[PDB]
Symmetry: C3
């Protein structure tokens, strides 16, 4: 298409699509209730991402926001993706270690604030206030990362959790950086590079993460 | 009002309203926890539909979307209705057969994708892409219908489930057809007829379904 | 700022922010699963309110709606706040008395209708219909208040529930009054006074409520 980031949106679409199909196939014939939870969560995540990547590719998930005296292209569909996929990823982690309901609520609530404030930040027309929202969102992320380390271990699941939590902490922490330097923030990195960066992170955090989880038998019970 | 479909919106409003009141009355004095689940779900469904039918009647739930070089009237409030009511109907089915959490998640997740992509399709300005979204939404529906047959039987509930699943499969499958031929899609059937069609389906799938469920003592325990 | 209600938005922001921090601090070192539920719910409520108060302060959460032949300032962010915070407050009450799932569903569903129809009412351009939505929303509120009295007692929790339910019934019942007389409704009270009123109610219903709950050991188990 006419926007140079189209190739990364097309690639993200294809990779989320393939990942979804792969997880769909791998989860066929799974009878264990706990495994069924993990396959459902883990397959949904790339399915959702697939749809939102497609919406970006086709132009539906893009809006123009005026700030700094110009029209800035903002892919709002990312936030629609993240709104559902990030709590689902936390839920995968949380179920893995049999987190109590209270901790799950805290995680999901904090995550909604993170994404919600991120979206407000992304759509805010007063440039300086965009970063206020960024800071609030980042505080919520830090709370999530804090809980992931200090807020939950059954030896069925201990080592897989530890790996998935580390992947999670590393990949998630990059998102606020990318937003801060990209088109939503300071605008030091052009939109095509920012889209490439989010695409690598997204596929890694969704399909990558899923592969690690759905390859470990921490999800199965004999 | 000035739009010929108003009569079907008025009738849908009245029928959802009456259905809600009826279920509200029938659920008074119900003490059994499991029955309370089914009455709550089943009463909420038409209550929600009532509100969205009203919004359509009054014009709030209607927007104009440009595609094919014209302004097309699109009732977006349908998707707001379906977003909550369709997962609730799946939940009624799922609770009936004591589905595990993983299957519930899969159903609700697939359903959100179905409705979500349907809405994107309904609001997409590039005509040809409207049908891409339709296809994705239909794939999600097919997955739901697949799970309803192959993805879950306690003899308390077996025969009522089978009836409700068949009603569900027949009525739900018509929605993508109606959308495809109506004002959101190919535009072969005028909006008034499409509204009539959705109204018959909606009342059948919500009030009709509810009557069957809430008349069978598959929901009660002595 | 240029809008006279800014002081009440600034004060609400500060008070929700401080309340969140206070509950965050009080919940540190809490190990009991049930207490963890109540701290998570109760801390999230003001955190969410904080974000939406901020959005109003900064102007993001304000839109202009034409009705009565003029442009009316409508703070839509209130509904975004209430959408999440009101069900969470009901959930606190419901968990306290070990409500069954069916009653929880009914409460949360009714609450969504209340807020949803409130928002439709707030954004409706035909003046007279604004009050139709108000009435539907108020009916949903009345149903909630009905369930809070007749729809659920374990002596661990009985007396704290009774206090929190009374605070809830008194404060919540004022919201429809304020909306009816304020800028969203009949317009007899200017927006600055209405904002002041909602701010007093909000802080009382969120931070006030939370203090009562999180000070009673009805949430702890030895
Ligand atoms: C595990 C559960 O832990 C706690 C139990 O003691 C409950 O969570 C208690 C906390 C719960 C979740 C709420 C945490 C917040 C989401 C963290 C950060 C959100 C901010 C972006 C917004 C708040 C602004 C600030 C000024 C308060
Ligand atoms: C645990 C559930 O809490 C879930 C609560 C979270 C979802 C937190 C909600 C707070 C958000 C900051 C709310 C923001 C929503 C709006 C910005 C969206 C409207 C977009 C605009 C273009 C109309
Ligand atoms: C019962 C649970 O079954 C599985 C356990 O093995 C988990 O669901 C595994 C599946 C879960 C739910 C995900 C299914 C999808 C919703 C089905 C179709 C969605 C599509 C419209 C979008 C994906 C596009 C395609 C190219 C992948
Ligand atoms: C199981 C929960 O998953 C729930 C996940 C599902 C809800 C799937 C979400 C994917 C949808 C395709 C997301 C689409 C939302 C937007 C189109 C809505 C914005 C409308 C526009 C006018 C701003
Ligand atoms: C406790 C559960 O109680 C019932 C079990 O018998 C189930 O709730 C049964 C009820 C459930 C919740 C549905 C109640 C409604 C939300 C109450 C009012 C909503 C209205 C604003 C909209 C409906 C319009 C009217 C004409 C029906
Ligand atoms: C229990 C879950 O039910 C949850 C169901 C409830 C959330 C009830 C939904 C009914 C509401 C009346 C739906 C209204 C939503 C729209 C008005 C929002 C769109 C805003 C507009 C500006 C696009
Ligand atoms: C698959 C997608 C994932 C795991 C996305 C994660 C996204 C984040 C952790 C985003 C975080 C943000 C902030 C902490 C600051 C504001 C900007 C956001 C929303 C990008
Ligand atoms: C009470 C309302 C019900 C049960 C509505 C069900 C709606 C559907 C099954 C809609 C399905 C659609 C597709 C599968 C294709 C795209 C268009 C939709 C959203 C109408
Ligand atoms: C912390 C915020 C709380 C507890 C807010 C509660 C809000 C209500 C009970 C609002 C009720 C409304 C009606 C019943 C009528 C229509 C207008 C509303 C949404 C203000």
């Amino acid at each position: 298409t006419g926007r140079p980031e189209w190739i990364w949106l097309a690639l993200g679409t294809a990779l989320m699509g393939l990942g979804t199909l792969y997880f769909l196939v791998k989860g066929m014939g799974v009878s264990d209730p706990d495994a069924k939870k993990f396959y459902a969560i883990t397959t949904l995540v790339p399915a959702i991402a697939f749809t939102m990547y497609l919406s970006m590719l086709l132009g539906y998930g893009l809006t123009m926001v005026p700030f700094g005296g110009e029209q800035n292209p903002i892919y709002w569909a990312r936030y629609a993706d993240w709104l559902f996929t990030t709590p689902l990823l936390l839920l995968d982690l949380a179920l893995l270690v049999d987190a109590d309901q209270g901790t799950i609520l805290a995680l999901v609530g904090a995550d909604g604030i993170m994404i919600g404030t991120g979206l407000v930040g992304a759509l805010t027309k007063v440039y300086s206030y965009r970063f206020v929202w960024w800071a609030i969102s980042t505080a919520a992320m830090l709370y999530i990362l804090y809980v992931l380390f200090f807020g939950f271990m059954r030896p069925e699941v201990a080592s897989t959790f530890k790996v998935l939590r580390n992947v999670t902490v590393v990949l998630w922490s990059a998102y606020p950086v990318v937003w801060l330097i990209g088109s939503e923030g300071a605008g030091i990195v052009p939109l095509n590079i920012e889209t490439l960066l989010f695409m690598v992170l997204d596929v890694s955090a969704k399909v990558g993460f899923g592969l690690i989880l759905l390859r470990s038998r921490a999800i199965f019970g004999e």
